[PDB]
A and B are shown apart, each in its own frame.
Chain A
Amino acid sequence: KALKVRTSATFRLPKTLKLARAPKYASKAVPHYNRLDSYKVIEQPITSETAMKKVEDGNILVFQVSMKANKYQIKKAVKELYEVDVLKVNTLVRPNGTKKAYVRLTADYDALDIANRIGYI
């Protein structure tokens, strides 16, 4: 025969137990593979005369790029594939709906050597 003592005149939800997920079956069978890997991130170089000029002069590669991709991914893909360190990436969306990346490499690497290694010029 005793009673609780309540200093506030407010009743709130008792913080009862939040029990965690423990499913009997997976939500999907197989994990999806990486949806945006490096070969999906970089599609094609861009070999317009302006882009090749920027290769020769600014040490800048010009790539066609997935619209779902961002600068982090582009940098990661370039470093992964062409074995190249990377400064500033700039990006635009072209008037045709594809993304264009201006990747500036560091001073140690030569974007033209990288380009003729990739095959184009």
Chain B
Amino acid sequence: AGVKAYELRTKSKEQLASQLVDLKKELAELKVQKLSRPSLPKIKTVRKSIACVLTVINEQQREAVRQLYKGKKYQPKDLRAKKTRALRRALTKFEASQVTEKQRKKQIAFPQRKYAIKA
């Protein structure tokens, strides 16, 4: 099966880099054997292991950047929400609910009431 991301997430950047370099070495030797001999599908497992390691490394780096830009304006564009363009555009909940003071006074004075027609 190869490597497992839950085992890799306990490691550091350096261990992961060493792991990845070793995996690339192994992939190269497997490529040589693949042409010396008719078939070799371990290359699949080692390729996906490289993929999982790179995934974990990117994840660590990104969460570090997130904790660096934690709770301040102007986060990077690959880290804002993607939601969709038109939503990232026009108004927020605050700005949409903004209401002038005349209208606020009227709302408080004369809200819609609950009423019932029996008696």
Q: Which residues of A contact B (CB under 8 A)?
A: 24-30, 33, 39, 42-45, 47, 118-120
A39-B35 contact, Cβ under 8 Å, with A24-B74, A30-B62 = no
Residues of A within 8 A of B35 (CB): 44-45, 47, 120
> Cβ of B36 and Cβ of A26 under 8 Å apart?
no
| A39 to B31 CA separation, bound complex (whole angstroms) | 11
Q: How large is the interface on B (under 10, 10 to 19, 20 to 34, 35 or more residues)?
A: 20 to 34
Tell whether, in the assembled complex, residue A25 and residue B76 are in contact, meaning their CB atoms are under 8 Å apart. Answer: yes
- Beyond A24-B74, A39-B24, A39-B27, whether A29 also contacts B62 by CB under 8 A is yes
Given A29-B65, A29-B78: 20 more A-B contacts, CB < 8 Å: A24-B73, A24-B74, A25-B69, A25-B76, A26-B76, A27-B77, A29-B61, A29-B62, A29-B76, A30-B58, A30-B65, A39-B25, A44-B31, A44-B32, A44-B35, A47-B36, A119-B29, A119-B33, A120-B32, A120-B36
Query: Is the contact region of chain A dominated by helix, strand, or loop, or is it mixed?
Result: loop
Would you list which residues of chain B between 44 and 102 have a CB under 8 Å from chain A? 54, 58, 61-62, 65, 69, 73-79
The 8 Å CB contact of B61, one of A27, A30, A43, is A30
B33: min CB distance to chain A, Å: 7
Q: Does B40 contact A (CB under 8 A)?
A: no
Question: Which 7 A-B pairs give the minimum distances between C-beta atoms?
Answer: A24-B74, A25-B74, A39-B24, A30-B61, A29-B65, A119-B32, A44-B31
The answer, yes or no, to whether B5 is at the interface (CB within 8 Å) is no
A39 to B29, CA, bound (A): 11
Instruction: Say how far B115's CB is from chain A's closest CB, in angstroms.
Output: 53
